Amino acid sequence: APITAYAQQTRGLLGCIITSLTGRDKNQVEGEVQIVSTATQTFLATCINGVCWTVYHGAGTRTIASPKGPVIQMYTNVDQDLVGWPAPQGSRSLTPCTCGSSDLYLVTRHADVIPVRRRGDSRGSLLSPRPISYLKGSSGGPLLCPAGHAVGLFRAAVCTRGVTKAVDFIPVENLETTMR
Amino acid sequence: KGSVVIVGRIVLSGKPAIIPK
Ligand SMILES: *C(=O)[C@@H](CC)[C@@H]1[C@@H](NS(C)(=O)=O)CCN1C(=O)[C@@H](NC(=O)OC(C)(C)C)C(C)C
Ligand SMILES: [Zn+2]
């Protein structure tokens, strides 16, 4: 049915730092998109096909904190700007899109869903341009097709004068490629 | 270098609900 989303915050500044250092995270996990932080930065990771993915330019080679200490990346592809860990216990994965639709829907770190028109393999245009401050920290989040299946991961925003009209994304296909 | 940390989540799979009292 219709895409709708909500956000919940599970950790504050201080538990985040401590957890970053111990690499030990005991909180229960839910949902399909995880809000993630480093020391300097916060963004999104999306679970597709049992793996939790996000952008290399944010995570780098870093481990992810888990109930069992740090967990090493399963996939690392610098050219694709794509990184992946095994999906946390309790997360739920998105299904890759197979309908080839050109009407995409980007899920934001604030849990808004904004319409995007597909204009290429890896680029889409916003139907309503937005201030860049808005999309900040949404990198790593999903572009969905009308059925709610994953088409791609938000990679970068094309901004002019602080206003975004287009986004570049990593297509689901490149995920599957990276998996091989 | 520190581990990436889950600080929050977005849930896509919830559907319309009457808010409980
Ligand atoms: C993701 O959340 C983007 C902000 C909208 C992204 C940032 N990623 S993150 C995970 O928050 O570290 C880093 C800067 N981001 C960009 O999209 C920058 N654009 C960029 O590299 O664009 C091209 C010129 C198209 C390659 C923008 C905002 C300056
Ligand atoms: Zn589809």
Side-chain angles (χ1 to χ4, degrees):
Chain A
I3 307 141
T4 64
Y6 66 86
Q8 284 170 321
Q9 175 166 0
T10 47
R11 239 169 226 307
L13 214 349
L14 197 43
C16 166
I17 298 152
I18 293 118
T19 310
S20 183
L21 295 159
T22 45
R24 193 161 307 259
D25 197 350
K26 288 283 154 158
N27 283 352
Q28 53 91 255
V29 185
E30 271 177 48
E32 299 82 3
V33 185
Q34 299 302 313
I35 308 171
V36 297
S37 246
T38 57
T40 60
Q41 258 160 354
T42 167
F43 45 102
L44 302 174
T46 303
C47 299
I48 302 157
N49 288 149
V51 170
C52 163
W53 302 92
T54 182
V55 281
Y56 178 88
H57 81 259
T61 37
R62 286 183 183 75
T63 54
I64 191 156
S66 91
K68 276 150 183 214
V71 167
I72 203 117
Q73 295 175 11
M74 267 180 94
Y75 307 103
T76 318
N77 176 1
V78 187
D79 296 344
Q80 240 70 80
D81 189 28
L82 172 67
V83 136
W85 294 278
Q89 294 296 321
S91 71
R92 201 138 305 278
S93 279
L94 290 178
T95 277
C97 180
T98 46
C99 71
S101 171
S102 261
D103 301 317
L104 311 182
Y105 302 94
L106 169 42
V107 178
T108 260
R109 58 169 289 116
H110 307 297
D112 302 329
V113 176
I114 67 194
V116 168
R117 183 82 188 149
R118 158 106 101 160
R119 295 233 182 272
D121 244 73
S122 82
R123 151 123 9 150
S125 61
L126 293 206
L127 300 204
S128 334
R130 286 233 165 186
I132 218 292
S133 100
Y134 184 94
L135 290 175
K136 225 209 64 148
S138 283
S139 298
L143 280 97
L144 307 179
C145 79
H149 295 174
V151 174
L153 300 187
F154 177 31
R155 209 208 111 235
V158 188
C159 117
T160 359
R161 271 140 200 121
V163 167
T164 311
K165 24 185 77 213
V167 305
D168 292 324
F169 59 89
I170 310 166
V172 264
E173 281 89 9
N174 300 34
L175 297 209
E176 311 205 299
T177 294
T178 298
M179 271 175 133
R180 297 178 204 113
Chain B
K1 213 149 250 218
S3 265
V4 168
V5 177
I6 300 170
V7 301
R9 49 168 168 254
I10 291 155
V11 170
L12 283 169
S13 66
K15 57 195 173 43
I18 289 177
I19 301 163
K21 297 235 23 128

